[PDB]
C-alpha cells in the first residue's frame, strides 16, 4: 500500500562529562530495524530486525562509517549553534534530525523529508519541493544561505528519488512476510466497579501492527468523544502495540454501551460489548 | 541505507 522509511538522529552535548553523544535509530513503517550509539564500546551500526541481517558486509561498513562521521558532524553543529544563539558552553543542548521517504504501491516516491531541530524547536527543514528550505529563525537562515550555496538540497533530492526508494523497496521485499502483513488486534472488554452505582468498562486492543488504530465507546450508539478516557498507543515490546479506551458508567447500563475497533488488519470495523 | 549529509550548520 503505502510505506515509509525514517532515520532519526540525536546529538546531545554534556560539558565536562565527555564529548557529545550521537544516537541513530532506523525505522521501516513502525518496525525498528537498525541502531547506532556513539557511547557503545566499539560503536557500529547494529541490526534490530531479522530481515536486515540479510545485507552483506559492504552494507555494514558503509553504515557504520556514516554514523561515525555523523558523530563528528553533529559535534560541529552543536558548537556552531552555541555561537549562533550566544549560549554559554556550560549548558547542555540537543540537535535532532529526521529524514526519509514514502512510497506508493508502484514504488514511486510519494514524498520526502529532512528536518532539523535545535533544542526541540524547528531549525531547518527541506520543503516538499525537495529544492528549497524553510528556516525557523535568523540563526537557521545562516545555515540556509550556506546550504543553498553548498547545494545540499540537490543531494537530498538525489537520495530521496534514488537510494531511499531503492533500499526501502528491498527491505519491504526481504521483510515482506512481516512488514506487509498487518496484525489484527486481539480485543476484549473488562469490568471494574467504582461504588454501587458506578462502574468502569475498559476496551482493550492488543498485539496489533501497525501502530495506527481507533477506539471509540458508544452509549446507545452515541459517540463519547468526551467521556472516554483514551491512553496513547503503547508498545508491547515484541514489535506490536497496545491501546485502551474507557468510560465511567452507572450499573445495569453496561449493555447500552458498545466498543468500536478500526484497524488495517481487520477486514471490517469491529463492534464489541461487556460480556455478562 | 543512509547517506552522508556532510554539510554543517
Amino acid at each position: 500500500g503505502s510505506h515509509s522509511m525514517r532515520y532519526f538522529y540525536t546529538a546531545m552535548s554534556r560539558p565536562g562529562r565527555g564529548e557529545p553523544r550521537f544516537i541513530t535509530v532506523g525505522y521501516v513503517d513502525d518496525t525498528l530495524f537498525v541502531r547506532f550509539d556513539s557511547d557503545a564500546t566499539s560503536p557500529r551500526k547494529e541490526p534490530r530486525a531479522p530481515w536486515i541481517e540479510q545485507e552483506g558486509p559492504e552494507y555494514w561498513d558503509r553504515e557504520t562509517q556514516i554514523s561515525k562521521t555523523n558523530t563528528q558532524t553533529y559535534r560541529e553543529n552543536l558548537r556552531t549553534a552555541l555561537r549562533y544563539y550566544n549560549q554559554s558552553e556550560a549548558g547542555s543542548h540537543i540537535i535532532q534530525r529526521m529524514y526519509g521517504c514514502d512510497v506508493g504501491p508502484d514504488g514511486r516516491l510519494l514524498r520526502g523529508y529532512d528536518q532539523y531541530a535545535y533544542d526541540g524547536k524547528d531549525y531547518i527543514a527541506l520543503n516538499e519541493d525537495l529544492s528549497s528550505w524553510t528556516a525557523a529563525d535568523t540563526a537557521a537562515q545562516i545555515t540556509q544561505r550556506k546550504w543553498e550555496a553548498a547545494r545540499v538540497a540537490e543531494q537530498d533530492r538525489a537520495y530521496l528519488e534514488g537510494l531511499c526508494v531503492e533500499s526501502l523497496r528491498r527491505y519491504l521485499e526481504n521483510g515482506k512476510e512481516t512488514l506487509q502483513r498487518a496484525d489484527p488486534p486481539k480485543t476484549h472488554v473488562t469490568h471494574h466497579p467504582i461504588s454501587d452505582h458506578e462502574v468502569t468498562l475498559r476496551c482493550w486492543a492488543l498485539g496489533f501492527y501497525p501502530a495506527e488504530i481507533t477506539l471509540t465507546w458508544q452509549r446507545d450508539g452515541e459517540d463519547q468523544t468526551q467521556d472516554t478516557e483514551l491512553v496513547e498507543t503503547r508498545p508491547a515490546g515484541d514489535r506490536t502495540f497496545q491501546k485502551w479506551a474507557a468510560v465511567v458508567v452507572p450499573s445495569g447500563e453496561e449493555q447500552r454501551y458498545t466498543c468500536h475497533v478500526q484497524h488495517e488488519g481487520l477486514p471490517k470495523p469491529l463492534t464489541l460489548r461487556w460480556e455478562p | 541505507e543512509e547517506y552522508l549529509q556532510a554539510f554543517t550548520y
Partner: T-cell receptor, first 111, second 112 residues
Framework: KTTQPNSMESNEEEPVHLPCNHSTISGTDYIHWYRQLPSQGPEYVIHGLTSNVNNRMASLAIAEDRKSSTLILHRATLRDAAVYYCILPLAGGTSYGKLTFGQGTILTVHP | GVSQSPRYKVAKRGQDVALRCDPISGHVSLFWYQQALGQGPEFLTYFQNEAQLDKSGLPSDRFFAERPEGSVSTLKIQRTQQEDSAVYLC???????????FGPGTRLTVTE
C-alpha cells in the same frame, strides 16, 4: 577516486575543457574542482552534484550518468596556467571533506 | 585570508621545528597538508575548533599539531629527517565540508 589527463595545452583566450572520470561515484557524492597556481596554495574553483553549475571563471558539466565531468574555463588567460584537481570529497559517504587531491591535470596556456 | 610563517625553513637533520598557521578569523575547521615536490597536497591532520579529530595522515609520531584556542595552529616536527622536506600547507574553512582557503605554505628543507 578520480582519473584525469596528466596534462593539457591550449591557446590563450580560448575555452578549455578539463576532463575528469569518476566511474564509481555515489548517487550522493559531490563533484569538486580545485586548482593550484605555480608557487601558491590550492584554491577552490567550483563544485556540483547532478545539475550543471556556473561561475564566473568556470562552468561544471556533469554527464547524465555522472560517471564523468568536465570543468570548463570559458576564456583561459596566462594566469590560468595551473594544476587542476578533480576531487570527490565525500568518498561515497565515508569521508567528511578533507581533500584527496589527485595527481591533477597540468594546464599550460600558450600565447 | 590564511597566513603561514615562516615562509621558508632550513633545518639541521635532528633538530626540532614548529610551523605556524593563522586561519581566517571565525573559521571552525583547519587542515594541514603535506605537498612533496611533484605531487598534489596530502592530508596530514584536521581540527574542529580545538579538537584534533583526524590525525590519520601523520607520517610518524614525530609530528605533533595543536590549536589551543581553536584559532592559530602549530605543527611541531621533532627530530627532523631528510624525508620531511616538503611544503607544508595550512587550510581553514567555514565548516568541515566547506571550501578550504589555503595559506601560501611553509617551505621546509632538512639538510645533514
Amino acid at each position: 577516486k578520480t582519473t584525469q589527463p596528466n596534462s593539457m595545452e591550449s591557446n590563450e583566450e580560448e575555452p578549455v575543457h578539463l576532463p575528469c572520470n569518476h566511474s564509481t561515484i555515489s548517487g550522493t557524492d559531490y563533484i569538486h574542482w580545485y586548482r593550484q597556481l605555480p608557487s601558491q596554495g590550492p584554491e577552490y574553483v567550483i563544485h556540483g552534484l547532478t545539475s550543471n553549475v556556473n561561475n564566473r571563471m568556470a562552468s561544471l558539466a556533469i554527464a547524465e550518468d555522472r560517471k564523468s565531468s568536465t570543468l570548463i574555463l570559458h576564456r583561459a588567460t596566462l594566469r590560468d596556467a595551473a594544476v587542476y584537481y578533480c576531487i570527490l570529497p565525500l568518498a561515497g559517504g565515508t569521508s567528511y571533506g578533507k581533500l584527496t587531491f589527485g595527481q591533477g591535470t597540468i594546464l599550460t596556456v600558450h600565447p | 585570508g590564511v597566513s603561514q610563517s615562516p615562509r621558508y625553513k632550513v633545518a639541521k637533520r635532528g633538530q626540532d621545528v614548529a610551523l605556524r598557521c593563522d586561519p581566517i578569523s571565525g573559521h571552525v575547521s583547519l587542515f594541514w597538508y603535506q605537498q612533496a615536490l611533484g605531487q598534489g597536497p596530502e592530508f596530514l591532520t584536521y581540527f574542529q575548533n580545538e579538537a584534533q579529530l583526524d590525525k590519520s595522515g601523520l607520517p610518524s609520531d614525530r609530528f605533533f599539531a595543536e590549536r589551543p584556542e581553536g584559532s592559530v595552529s602549530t605543527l611541531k616536527i621533532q627530530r627532523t629527517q631528510q624525508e620531511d622536506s616538503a611544503v607544508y600547507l595550512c587550510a581553514s574553512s567555514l565548516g568541515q565540508a566547506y571550501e578550504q582557503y589555503f595559506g601560501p605554505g611553509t617551505r621546509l628543507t632538512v639538510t645533514e
